[PDB]
Amino acid sequence: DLKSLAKRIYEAYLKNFNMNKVKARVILSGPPFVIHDMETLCMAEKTLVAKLVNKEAEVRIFHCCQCTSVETVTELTEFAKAIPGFANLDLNDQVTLLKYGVYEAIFAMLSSVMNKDGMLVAYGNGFITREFLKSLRKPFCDIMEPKFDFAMKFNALELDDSDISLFVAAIICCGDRPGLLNVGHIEKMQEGIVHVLRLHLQSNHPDDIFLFPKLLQKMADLRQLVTEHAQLVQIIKKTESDAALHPLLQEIYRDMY
Amino acid sequence: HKILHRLLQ
Ligand SMILES: CSc1ccc(C(=O)/C=C/c2cc(C)c(OC(C)(C)C(=O)O)c(C)c2)cc1
């Protein structure tokens, strides 16, 4: 019953996200083209985003990041639509939950394609190194390093996709978002998902008896990561003309934090 | 939020 809510959420995760942790680990275990310097970035661009190539490399990369985000937002909207109870909410609350939750979910899921040396990109066909991203000019070199720091500690929890699907549902189904209309119903929806997450972790991770409170803390850490990311994005938009922001992403950030 | 609202429709 609750086991079935957990399975339905996991099934919806496997169906709606192009990348999952099993798929990513297969690729990361050895084929992705390695982007480790300007030469290989330019090569990967010609093979994997050929239409895109011509501002500075950093602005081209930032454009690619946005395309990745827009795609993941669409996947999250479908996944959410598949979360039992979500589609019965007021359409305006559905928008609010997704507006505040998508980047928390994005950076949680990004951990699955990250290791200490770099991350998968372009639908698993590239691997960009962490040191290359640090090498970009300011402010672009400041984007990803806090996400790697989050991911190394998140990955140390050794969650699998059955855990992560419930965690992403719990992020989305969050009753304390600003502007909610039916807070009471959302809190009950959230309580039900968190209940299923709590029991699932007890079953799937009997070795780690604090895993549930650890994940509650990661949820709070993600909120802060998102606030800080949104601040950097605002600095980039105001100080870099070549770095326009996609309209869906402007809509999400607008009046967020 | 017209894109989200349409994405959800
Ligand atoms: C082919 S090169 C390449 C491809 C993909 C990636 C990548 O994974 C992106 C991570 C990433 C990067 C950035 C700037 C990012 O913030 C943007 C897009 C403005 C936002 O939506 O707020 C997010 C949310 C995620 C890096 C390089």
Residue numbers in the entry:
A (entry chain A): 202 to 231, 237 to 259, 265 to 468
B (entry chain B): 687 to 695
Sentences reproduced from the published study:
PPARs belong to the nuclear receptor superfamily and the ligand-activated transcription factors; they exist in three subtypes in mammals (namely, PPARα, PPARβ/δ, and PPARγ) with considerable amino acid identity (54–71% in humans). The ligand-bound activated forms of PPARs are stabilized by associations with specific coactivators, thereby enabling the regulation of specific gene expression. The carboxylic groups of the PPAR ligands are known to stabilize the AF-2 helix 12 through hydrogen bonds (red dotted lines) and electrostatic interactions (blue dotted lines) with the four surrounding consensus amino acids: Ser280/Tyr314/His440/Tyr464 in PPARα-LBD, Thr253/His287/His413/Tyr437 in PPARδ-LBD, and Ser289/His323/His449/Tyr473 in PPARγ-LBD. When compared to the LBPs of other nuclear receptors that have 600–1100 Å3 cavities, the LBPs of PPARα/δ/γ have relatively large (1300–1440 Å3) cavities that are able to accept 1–4 ligand molecules.
The PPARα-LBD–elafibranor cocrystals were obtained by soaking the PPARα-LBD–clofibric acid–SRC1 cocrystals in a buffer containing elafibranor. X-ray diffraction analyses revealed the monomeric structure with a single elafibranor and SRC1. Unexpectedly, the PPARα/δ dual agonist elafibranor activated all PPAR subtypes with potencies (EC50) of 388 nM (for α) < 2.12 µM (for γ) < 3.13 µM (for δ) and efficacies of 38.5% (for α/γ) > 14.8% (for δ), thereby acting like a PPARα/γ dual agonist. Although elafibranor recruited PGC1α to all PPARα/δ/γ-LBD structures with similar potencies and efficacies, it recruited SRC1 with a higher potency and efficacy to PPARα-LBD (4.95 µM and 59.2%) than to PPARδ/γ-LBD. In contrast, elafibranor did not significantly alter the Tm values in the PPARα/δ/γ-LBD complexes. Interestingly, the impact of elafibranor on the thermal stability of PPARα/δ/γ-LBD was much weaker than that of other ligands. Regrettably, we failed to obtain PPARδ/γ-LBD–elafibranor cocrystals, although elafibranor did activate PPARδ/γ to some extent. Therefore, it might be difficult for elafibranor to form stable complexes with any of the PPAR subtypes, especially with PPARδ/γ, and to induce enough clinical impact in some cases (e.g., NASH). Further clinical trials have suggested that elafibranor can improve peripheral and hepatic insulin sensitivity. As its EC50 values for PPARα/δ/γ-LBD were in small ranges (0.4–3 µM in Figure 1D and 5–16 µM in Figure 2E,F), elafibranor in clinical doses seems to be able to activate all PPAR subtypes at once.
